[PDB]
RNA sequence: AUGGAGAGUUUGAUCCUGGCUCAGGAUGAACGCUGGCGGCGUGCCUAAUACAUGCAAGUCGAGCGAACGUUAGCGGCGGACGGGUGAGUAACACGUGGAUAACCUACCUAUAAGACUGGGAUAACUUCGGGAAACCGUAGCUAAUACCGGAUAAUAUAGAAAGACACUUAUAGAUGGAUCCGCGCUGCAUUAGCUAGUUGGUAAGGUAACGGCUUACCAAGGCAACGAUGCAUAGCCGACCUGAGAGGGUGAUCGGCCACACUGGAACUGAGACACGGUCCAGACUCCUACGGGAGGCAGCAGUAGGGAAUCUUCCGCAAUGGGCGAAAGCCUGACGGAGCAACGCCGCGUGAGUGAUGAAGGUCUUCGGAUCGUAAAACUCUGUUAUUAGGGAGAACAUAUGUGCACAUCUUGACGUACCUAAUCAGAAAGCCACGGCUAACUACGUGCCAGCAGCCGCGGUAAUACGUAGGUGGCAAGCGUUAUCCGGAAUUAUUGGGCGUAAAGCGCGCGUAGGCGGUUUUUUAAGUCUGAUGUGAAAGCCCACGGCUCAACCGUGGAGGGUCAUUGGAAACUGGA
């Protein structure tokens, strides 16, 4: 009766539109592109702030994967 | 019997079943020094129970009609 | 949601419940995070409330309450009046 | 519990101890079939089984019903050999065989209603009563004076040890500790102390 | 050492090895039945037997649009969890440890956190052509603590939507999995062998991890006896019998885990699957039929059909114990509880004699000799323990004005409601079946007379079978009794305590040769070694030294005692086969 999304939702969270997941994948496609082109998107590492007004304000990515890119960023400055 | 098996069975006692082509329980026991038959046949068991002649058994050999 | 669930284990029709820091998603035999000895409600011996929640003091700060509605069972374990 | 003749207990067994004269009008020879022939010699396991059958007619509880009796005469700590004569006198027949109600054990088991039963409080209509230091196996208020309870009140003068009995009372509440050698000695002790163990 | 252990079988009796025909308990049982009353439990054991069903579990505004605390239905939220049967991994899969420089650690609630910053908008409402249902069309929309990244903290040294008189980065409180080795695993003689990046090398990545995963390349008869490699196939364990111990067994329970979900196969945004009733794809099935369709849990419950010598009702309730929904309240439950169920073991209150005429009216064997089925007995008294209506009432224990830091107040219960018992003291019945010459505690008359019976061992039947069948019986035991398949007494019987190196149970004719199984070498060694050492721990459906009562039954606390610990050398060398 109650839609499950806290227990075994491995395939329950993998059964709808992936447009937003694909759109977020295109935004994280410049991970090495901006680093190889020296973009200003990864500039000013005092913020990325990216822990005082980013994660909660507006964020929609992965966990461990993002954490890897959330280590060098938000701390470099 | 069942499972496509054929054995030289024999009805021990005086019981003379008169119902052919009918299932008959195989008495759990073999014969004693009898070249040919190597198995027994249980009296009654969805067939001719037997005769009421004997009354000293009242346990096996299709016994029934307890005298009072 | 993580209170002191009474682990119902032992023989049939006579489970020996043992108050332990368990979750609400794992009822009866689930997962104990902070075991608290065991409660004996046999009412035929002296040692009854033999709960050892010495390491359960950290549990009472972010997720700790009653699982099997045991107010008098937790009444003996008076570890409050200090906050 | 045996529902049979109580005169074959001194013929099939070798230790009856239930009546004075029994072979006076009978034939004290051997068994039944070969009663006019010679006797035999009890076997090692046979002697321990003969005593069990001898006590089977004596004790009210038979095989499985006397679980406690055999359990109290085996695992119980103490003289294991004489544990069959020590931890086995806690029945309700002992009170009737010490106060003067029933001379037999089978009649003593049926004397837990017609004779004294109210053991200072809760009574028991079984073959064994919980008579300990504080229990007074007496009669009831309506059954104070019975016919089988006050039968041999003067016929049975000599009483046994660890037992009490008076006129218009018959209430046993003396010593709780009994003797392990105050019973007939015809069966082996270590034999039943080992066979039972198995 | 609570301290096993019969025979026959072979002359006409025999000893002696040897094997079981056979002096017993057990029998998840059924059984032909003579199965008075019952506390408690198991019950398609024969059956992963096919399929009509009753059927998984509903909800929520402190945060939003009916007519009238949530009433509009969106959003938080178990379909995989309760469950069901166990064909399925001869093996970390489970049983069983430290662990992790093989390690992830999503997660669950408290505080930082200032409700910040880009927002339109969303189901309902509903403009709504038709369609037997088998689906497109006509389409505007309106919300909600539904909801949107960069510059100012976290491996640097490149913060929000809002709570009453909710909250977010950091993280804690908490939390689920992958892993090393030490442990459970059949033999083939009528098979005697198997891996080749077998054996180790480092580099394209990415997941619980190194990575022979692929990465460049790498050997010959090498691997393997550790039968790897073939099979055997089974859900694994906590367990109960057992020799007296020495030996030996080692799972029905009841819970953990490991599975499965017509059959397979490939993928699918929100928080940990292949999903017991979401997808798609195919296959052979299910059935009605508007020509199109629906598809199947009954692997959730109870049933129709299956053949079972061998097994539960298509019955009430959520008392309660639950958890999931859900400011409370509300609200969910063939999870679970209560009644039908059979000798399934019930063993006892257990059913009448205080008294008592040869106790017969004459029969049980009767050469009648007496006794007696017979201190059976009359007919009463006796024995209470049958009704007669009865009103009856521990796993799991604290609460609900708004007056109260793991403490708690006006105000929170029933699906019930007849143990032992000395009491009313009506009269409600322990019978039975078996051997009876026996072996083995047991019989008299007739009737039989190799006709039939009896018939484990004996055998009894061609005449005087009390062995047969009826009557009077007798030994046994216990509300009953004979039967069928399953361990151990029997007895060591691949010998292990429990085998010879000759008749027994035993001469390889193989005379010439290392299977490393094993066959004096003096002294001599540096410490293979016998008895001391980290001891915390010392737990346990474990024999707990006691521990609680249910009379006959399931009523359970003691981790130090308590063994079933978890000090037995680092060590004292003139010494199995090898000097």
Rg of chain C (C-alpha, Å): 13 Å
Query: Topology as H/E string of chain C?
Result: EEEEEEEH
- Order the strands across the largest sheet of chain C as they lie in space: 1-4-5
For the biggest sheet of chain C, the summary is: 3 strands, antiparallel
- Helix segment tally of chain B: 0
Helix content of chain B: under 10%
Shape of chain B: globular
Structural class of chain C: mainly beta
Structural class of the helix and strand makeup of chain B? little secondary structure
Report the span from N to C terminus of chain B.
38 Å
First CA to last CA of chain C: what distance? 21 Å
- As an assembly, this protein is part of a larger assembly
Number of DSSP E strands of chain C: 7
Protein name (chain A): Small ribosomal subunit protein bS20
GO molecular function (chain A): small ribosomal subunit rRNA binding; structural constituent of ribosome
Organism (chain A): Staphylococcus aureus
Function (chain A): Binds directly to 16S ribosomal RNA.
Overview of the structural elements:
The structure is cut from a larger assembly and holds chains A (77 residues), B (68 residues), C (83 residues) and D (198 residues). Chain A is built from three helices and no strands. Chain A has 77 residues and is mostly helical. The termini of chain A are far apart. Chain B is globular. By secondary structure, chain C is mostly beta strands. Chain C starts with a strand and ends in an 8-residue tail after the last helix. The chains hardly touch. Chain B: Belongs to the universal ribosomal protein uS12 family. Chain B: Part of the 30S ribosomal subunit. Contacts proteins S8 and S17. May interact with IF1 in the 30S initiation complex. Chain B: It comes from Staphylococcus schweitzeri. Chain B: This is Small ribosomal subunit protein uS12.
Topology readout:
The structure is cut from a larger assembly and holds chains A (77 residues), B (68 residues), C (83 residues) and D (198 residues).
Chain B: no helix or strand
Chain C: E1 4-6, E2 10-11, E3 14-15, E4 19-22, E5 32-35, E6 38-39, E7 49-50, H1 71-75
Antiparallel strand pairs in C: 1-4, 2-3, 4-5, 6-7
Chain D: H1 44-58, H2 67-72, H3 83-86, H4 93-99, H5 106-109, H6 190-195
Chain C binds one RNA strand of 579 nucleotides through strand 2, strand 3 and helix 1.
Subunit structure (chain D): Part of the 30S ribosomal subunit. Contacts protein S5. The interaction surface between S4 and S5 is involved in control of translational fidelity.
Protein name (chain D): Small ribosomal subunit protein uS4
Keywords (chain D): Ribonucleoprotein, Ribosomal protein, RNA-binding, rRNA-binding
Gist of the model:
The structure is cut from a larger assembly and holds chains A (77 residues), B (68 residues), C (83 residues) and D (198 residues). Chain A is mostly helical.
């Amino acid at each position: 009766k109650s839609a499950i999304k806290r227990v075994k939702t491995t395939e329950k969270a993998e059964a709808r539109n992936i447009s937003q997941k694909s759109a977020m994948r295109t935004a994280v496609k410049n991970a090495k592109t901006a680093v190889s082109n020296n973009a200003d998107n990864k500039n000013e590492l005092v913020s990325l702030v990216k822990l005082v007004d980013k994660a909660a304000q507006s964020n929609l990515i992965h966990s461990n994967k993002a954490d890897r890119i959330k280590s060098q960023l938000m701390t470099a400055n | 019997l069942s499972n496509n098996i054929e054995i030289n069975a024999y009805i021990p006692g005086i019981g003379h079943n008169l119902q052919e082509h009918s299932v008959v329980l195989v008495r759990g026991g073999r014969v004693k020094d009898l070249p040919g038959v190597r198995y027994h046949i249980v009296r009654g068991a969805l067939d001719t129970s037997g005769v009421d002649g004997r009354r000293q058994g009242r346990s096996l050999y299709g016994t029934k009609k307890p005298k009072n | 949601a993580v209170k002191i669930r009474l682990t119902r284990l032992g023989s049939k029709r006579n489970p020996f419940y043992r108050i332990v820091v368990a979750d609400a998603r794992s009822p009866r035999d689930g997962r104990i995070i902070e075991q608290i000895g065991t409660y004996n409600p046999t009412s035929a011996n002296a040692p009854e409330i033999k709960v050892d929640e010495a390491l359960a003091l950290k549990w009472l700060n972010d997720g700790a309450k009653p699982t099997d509605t045991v107010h008098n069972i937790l009444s003996k374990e008076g570890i409050m009046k200090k906050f | 519990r045996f529902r049979g003749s109580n005169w074959k207990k001194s013929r099939r067994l070798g230790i009856s101890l239930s009546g004075t004269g029994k072979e006076l009008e009978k034939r004290p020879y051997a068994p039944g079939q070969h009663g006019p022939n010679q006797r035999k010699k009890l076997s090692e396991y046979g002697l321990q089984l003969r005593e069990k059958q001898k006590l089977r007619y004596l004790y009210g509880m038979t095989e499985r019903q006397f679980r406690n009796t055999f359990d109290i005469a085996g695992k119980k700590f103490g003289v294991h050999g004489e544990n069959f004569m020590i931890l086995l006198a806690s029945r309700l027949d002992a009170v009737v065989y010490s106060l003067g109600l029933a001379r037999t054990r089978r009649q003593a088991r049926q004397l837990v209603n017609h004779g004294h039963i109210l053991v200072d409080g809760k009574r028991v209509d079984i073959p064994s009563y919980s008579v300990k230091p504080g229990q007074t196996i007496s009669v009831r208020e309506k059954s104070q004076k019975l016919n089988i309870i006050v039968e041999s009140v003067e016929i049975n003068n000599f009483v046994p040890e660890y037992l009490n009995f008076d006129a218009d009372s018959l209430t046993g509440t003396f010593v709780r500790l009994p003797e392990r050698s105050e019973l007939p000695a015809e069966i082996n002790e270590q034999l039943i102390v080992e066979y039972y163990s198995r």
